[PDB]
Amino acid sequence: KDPQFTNVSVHDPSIVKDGDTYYIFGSHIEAAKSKDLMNWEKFTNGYTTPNNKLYGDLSKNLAGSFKWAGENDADSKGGFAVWAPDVFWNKDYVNEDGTKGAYMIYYSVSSTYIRSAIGYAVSKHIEGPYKYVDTIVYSGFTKEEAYDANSKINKKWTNTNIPKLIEQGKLKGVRADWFHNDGSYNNRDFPNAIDPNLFYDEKGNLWMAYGSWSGGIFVLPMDKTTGKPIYPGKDGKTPDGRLVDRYFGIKIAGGYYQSGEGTYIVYDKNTDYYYLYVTYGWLGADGGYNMRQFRSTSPTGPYVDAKGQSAVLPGEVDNSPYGNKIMGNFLFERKVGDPGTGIGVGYVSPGHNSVYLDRKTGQQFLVFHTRFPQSGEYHEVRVHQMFMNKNGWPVVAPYRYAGEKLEKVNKQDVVGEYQLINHGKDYSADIKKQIFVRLNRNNTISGDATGTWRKIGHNQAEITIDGETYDGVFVRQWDPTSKRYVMAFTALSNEGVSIWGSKLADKTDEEIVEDVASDLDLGDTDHVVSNLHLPTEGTRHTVISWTTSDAKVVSETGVVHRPEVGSAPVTATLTATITKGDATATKVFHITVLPYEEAKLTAHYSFDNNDLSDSTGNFGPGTITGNRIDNEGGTIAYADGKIGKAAVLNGQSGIRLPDGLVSSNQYSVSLWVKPEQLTTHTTTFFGAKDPNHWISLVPQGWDGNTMLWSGSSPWYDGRTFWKIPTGQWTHLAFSVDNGAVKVYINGVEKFSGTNFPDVFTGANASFALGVNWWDPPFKGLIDELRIYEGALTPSQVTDLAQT
Ligand SMILES: [Ca+2]
Ligand SMILES: [Ca+2]
């Protein structure tokens, strides 16, 4: 269990080493340091200012760049957007006192998807404070006077550095093609000016690559004395056809609006290649963020991948085929019986990397952020070691770095059963999972795949599966799931596809089948009220076969049938027969399924007496609001309803119900509605402990359909995929039983879900009909608001809907 980690959240990390300490510098002015690439310590204060750790008075220091983007403008309204910086010691930088040597930080500011710039600051010491020097590349400028929403920044090109560059003779003049006909920024072909990367070339010259979606990635030579670009000064094309622009530089990747950002280029003197890393997709859990790799013999390109395809796209096309996909979404999924606990180690949207290539030892490290399965938008930094393969491509270790190095590996330490992940070319929210194969002593591969393998020398790995040869290495890795150092491989084929392998411990089929049986647990089976998940597989393709002693209670697949209200609970046995090879084992679970129980009526605001009272007598009456839950001023009239009279909601008014109307996590709500008009997010039934802890029944939700909705800790989308009509009556109802939530329309279940939050227990919530804190009030009639203790039975709901 030896290795220990200490994690930090630094989005878009840029690695740099100062003495023997590693530093990472990310977006949102976050930075952290480590002595070992495993245990990190943050030393920054985010966007705090003044007293900003990295910038001091942030607003004053960087005002130069902030006049164009990234401070309290458009998308940065209310705050700041200082993104994706790069840091490196420039030994030739002439400081303002004439001394030589500074740490330079090139940063992005951005106010929309397109209006951005890159600027830089310098410090003699890596922990700052860094001091502004200049803003050097701008994007999102226009032909004429123009303004984005929530901004009064004149986006005209004359507000950039372009006039002064022209005055210095560094540019002929404005380039017509930077603009569409309407005068707007041509980001089909030219870049978003963010995500800079500074690298030295074979000859010790300095380049900056940058870009993000839009027209793609560009690169510019840079003066080592001052940090300023040495702008091309004229447009042209590279011999192989790539755009050269007088100002933006030389396009080396992307194009035509497609994804691709977080560029990092490394010169490798052992191989004499320039390696180009770039991240595709969107950074969110759902965005399929994935790292790609190309190479060039020249810093200025052409960069190509293992199939010789260009990094620069031929057009507005899917960028999937292009670049070696070195990491996407994956999971070494723990199956029933595996050691450890949890779902296993996997990543979601890993990306925006930097790289540290140690000069002495050739050791190489991919540094990046990632999200995780079942943790939403939470992100931490990861470090994965890389190793040059025999075709001149660094290959990425499957697990995060844990002190390991390349070694002499004996054949006996390799032969065995493996988990195998193939990263493919495709990317999406989907997550890749392991297959199970074996590398056999006779140099074949068997199991889920077939083919061959060899080890050359100490550790080169060659693996050929179905005619594809992947080359890479064998290396020992820390597997945190099993808590062992295990043998592993990583290898890349000539499609630019990476496979990763983790060696499973040797176990007999008897031992595996025993492990599966021990780990197999169905939770509470004495109080069953909804279907059971019954896994049909355990580790290494163990088969779990289920039989029931009585399908009336519960099927072979865990489908339950609750007895009617009034009937006894029914019991049944489920038997798991667990097999692998010729070994078998048995585990019995005794299942008690509970009958339905009727929800009890606890409040009835019927409006039948032309008033706001509760007919059950349990609650005080409703009172009248204005256009919000917490204001007054409105009116309620009473018109002819679906049942008796009904409340008329004019569009400026609502009803405030008593606090605590629901005070539990087992409850239901039922009501009738006749909307005269539809407005988005507008509530009918609304209950809230506060503006970040509420539930709402919404006729036209964010997806344009009726939903049950909760926010903001956590969000929950109870989606129905059913549009409500205006000018007609619709019954709506929902139940919440300790996590289980269901939503009915006109008697029919249209959403069923789990994990639903308990908003109404831990303090008395406010409640209302037709109004909340933000949205247009409901316009129409509402009728028969009924509240319950407990979840309504299906038939109870059909009853209610049945008028
Ligand atoms: Ca970067
Ligand atoms: Ca009524």
TrEMBL record:
<dbReference type="GO" id="GO:0004553">
    <property type="term" value="F:hydrolase activity, hydrolyzing O-glycosyl compounds"/>
</dbReference>
<feature type="binding site">
    <location>
        <position position="645"/>
    </location>
    <ligand>
        <name>Ca(2+) 2</name>
    </ligand>
</feature>
<dbReference type="InterPro" id="IPR046780">
    <property type="entry name" value="aBig_2"/>
</dbReference>
<dbReference type="GO" id="GO:0005975">
    <property type="term" value="P:carbohydrate metabolic process"/>
</dbReference>
<feature type="binding site">
    <location>
        <position position="608"/>
    </location>
    <ligand>
        <name>Ca(2+) 2</name>
    </ligand>
</feature>
<dbReference type="InterPro" id="IPR006710">
    <property type="entry name" value="Glyco_hydro_43"/>
</dbReference>
<comment type="similarity">
    <text>Belongs to the glycosyl hydrolase 43 family.</text>
</comment>
<feature type="binding site">
    <location>
        <position position="352"/>
    </location>
    <ligand>
        <name>Ca(2+) 1</name>
    </ligand>
</feature>
<dbReference type="Pfam" id="PF20578">
    <property type="entry name" value="aBig_2"/>
</dbReference>
<feature type="binding site">
    <location>
        <position position="606"/>
    </location>
    <ligand>
        <name>Ca(2+) 2</name>
    </ligand>
</feature>
<keyword id="KW-0479">Metal-binding</keyword>
<dbReference type="InterPro" id="IPR013320">
    <property type="entry name" value="ConA-like_dom_sf"/>
</dbReference>
<dbReference type="InterPro" id="IPR032291">
    <property type="entry name" value="Abn2_C"/>
</dbReference>
<dbReference type="Pfam" id="PF04616">
    <property type="entry name" value="Glyco_hydro_43"/>
</dbReference>
<dbReference type="InterPro" id="IPR023296">
    <property type="entry name" value="Glyco_hydro_beta-prop_sf"/>
</dbReference>
<feature type="binding site">
    <location>
        <position position="783"/>
    </location>
    <ligand>
        <name>Ca(2+) 2</name>
    </ligand>
</feature>
<dbReference type="InterPro" id="IPR050727">
    <property type="entry name" value="GH43_arabinanases"/>
</dbReference>
<keyword id="KW-0378">Hydrolase</keyword>
<feature type="binding site">
    <location>
        <position position="643"/>
    </location>
    <ligand>
        <name>Ca(2+) 2</name>
    </ligand>
</feature>
<feature type="binding site">
    <location>
        <position position="784"/>
    </location>
    <ligand>
        <name>Ca(2+) 2</name>
    </ligand>
</feature>
<protein>
    <submittedName>
        <fullName>Extracellular arabinanase</fullName>
    </submittedName>
</protein>
<dbReference type="Pfam" id="PF16369">
    <property type="entry name" value="GH43_C"/>
</dbReference>
<keyword id="KW-1015">Disulfide bond</keyword>
<dbReference type="GO" id="GO:0046872">
    <property type="term" value="F:metal ion binding"/>
</dbReference>
<dbReference type="Pfam" id="PF13385">
    <property type="entry name" value="Laminin_G_3"/>
</dbReference>
<comment type="pathway">
    <text>Glycan metabolism; L-arabinan degradation.</text>
</comment>
<dbReference type="InterPro" id="IPR006558">
    <property type="entry name" value="LamG-like"/>
</dbReference>
<keyword id="KW-0732">Signal</keyword>
<keyword id="KW-0326">Glycosidase</keyword>
<keyword id="KW-0106">Calcium</keyword>
